[PDB]
Amino acid sequence: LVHVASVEKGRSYEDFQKVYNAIALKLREDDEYDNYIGYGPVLVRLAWHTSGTWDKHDNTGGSYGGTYRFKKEFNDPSNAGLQNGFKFLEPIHKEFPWISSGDLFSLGGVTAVQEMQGPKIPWRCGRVDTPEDTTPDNGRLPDADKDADYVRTFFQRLNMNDREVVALMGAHALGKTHLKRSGYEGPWGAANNVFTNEFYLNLLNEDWKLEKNDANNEQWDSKSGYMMLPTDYSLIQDPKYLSIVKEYANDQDKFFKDFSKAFEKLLENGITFPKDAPSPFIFKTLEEQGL
Ligand code: HEM
């Protein structure tokens, strides 16, 4: 099945910059969430999980249809906690009812990365809501208790190569694991609502110990109070991933550029953009606008 991008009727860059801005202003205002981490990280994860159900083999799942709004997908165990990002976006959608669900979930992620001082992420409009029976089944998002071979094979289904995988994983600088959500507990670093290459630096430079958490799952822990999932740690166990981790730990600009490309790609998988579609939009941050 082909999913052709269809611009919300009559809308242009300024309309979407207004949606961006409303997201960004609420991110600033609603600062208490998650012990003052704020909503940035969970909005990035919402964008990824709503895109990451895609299957390149038959074009099922993906960001286009905004199917997270249906109960089979919002109740996926893999999505536990993302309801907080959805609730955040509800007043945004009420103010701007013309935006599609897929466009809003993906734009939330872009806006969060940029407002957290991350790279610019070009973003295209035109996702169209599809019906409840197009919702992908549970089980397409990845397990955390696995090794590098698992990670590499998993991401082939999303058409991501080694560099794209290691770059995307750098988003684990953000937010934290929550025991009641995923069976893992703790942040990956100190700067968890500012977008930096800290994930790679901590992988290489902390002294990690393999411990069991209070849900009886293994995770890697440091004396600084940081953690890594087994799938994170696999990036320094596999020699191909290790090389790339070292590259990003040593070049913040390269990480930013490669993350931006991979994240846009993730958010666009499955979508056909007509030859005469608008060019991708690059939104200004609140700071750049003086707001
Ligand atoms: C092998 C792939 C991956 C696995 C197994 C994985 C697993 C996890 C787990 C278990 C959590 C903690 C959930 C919780 O307890 O709240 C988490 C959080 C998160 N993940 Fe991933 N992840 C992967 C890839 C990614 C990618 C590709 C991105 C986005 C580019 C991403 C962004 C995030 C963010 C931002 C959080 C923090 C959420 C919060 O603080 O609420 N992850 N991930």
The full set of domain ranges for the chain reads 1-141+263-291, 142-262
260 lines ligand 1 (CB under 6 A): no
Question: Hey, whose CA ends up nearest to atom 10 of ligand 1?
Answer: 182
CATH architecture, domain 142-262 = Orthogonal Bundle (1.10)
| Calpha distance 227→248 (Å, rounded) | 19
| Calpha distance 267→76 (Å, rounded) | 19
Q: For the chain, first and last CA: distance in Å?
A: 42
Q: Are 92 and 19 in contact (CB under 8 A)?
A: yes
Tell me: domain 1-141+263-291, CATH 1.10.3080.10, correct?
no
**What's the burial of 178, exposed, middle or buried (CB within 10 Å: 0-12/13-18/19+)?**
middle
State the Cα torsion 85-198-115-23 to the nearest 10°. Answer: 0
- Is 93 one of the annotated active-site residues of the chain? no
* List 54, 188, 208, 220, catalytic entry: 188
Q: Specify the 3-state DSSP secondary structure of 92.
A: helix
Q: Are 139 and 228 in contact (CB under 8 A)?
A: no
Q: Are 155 and 162 in contact (CB under 8 A)?
A: no
Q: Specify the 3-state DSSP secondary structure of 227.
A: strand
Residue 134 CA to ligand 1 center (angstroms) comes to 24
**What's the burial of 29, exposed, middle or buried (CB within 10 Å: 0-12/13-18/19+)?**
exposed
- Is 57 one of the annotated active-site residues of the chain? no
| H/E run at residue 24 | helix 13-29
Q: By what method was this entry solved? A: X-ray
Give whole-number Cα distances, 177 to 139, 166, 219, 229, 248, in Å: 19, 19, 11, 9, 22
**What's the burial of 213, exposed, middle or buried (CB within 10 Å: 0-12/13-18/19+)?**
middle
Tell me the residue type at 8.
E
| Calpha distance 99→23 (Å, rounded) | 13
Looking from the CA of residue 192, the nearest atom of ligand 1 is 40
Do domains 1-141+263-291 and 142-262 share one topology? The answer is: no
For residue 87, the tally of other CB atoms under 10 A from its CB is: 10
Largest CA distance in the chain: 55
For residue 290, the tally of other CB atoms under 10 A from its CB is: 6
Q: What are the DSSP E strand ranges found in 180-270?
A: 209-212, 218-221, 227-228
| Calpha distance 163→6 (Å, rounded) | 31
What's the token pair of residue 22? 């409303």
Residue 177 CA to ligand 1 center (angstroms) comes to 8
Place of tokens 């407002």: 115
278 lines ligand 1 (CB under 6 A): no
- 57 in a labelled binding site: no
Parallel, antiparallel, or unpaired for β 3-4 and 209-212?
unpaired
| Calpha distance 65→100 (Å, rounded) | 9
88 lines ligand 1 (CB under 6 A): no
Parallel, antiparallel, or unpaired for β 227-228 and 218-221?
antiparallel
Q: Are 129 and 102 in contact (CB under 8 A)?
A: yes
Residue 11 CA to ligand 1 center (angstroms) comes to 32
Give whole-number Cα distances, 172 to 16, 44, 217, 227, in Å: 27, 10, 19, 10
| Calpha distance 246→200 (Å, rounded) | 7
* List 49, 123, 208, 220, catalytic entry: 49
| Calpha distance 205→42 (Å, rounded) | 26
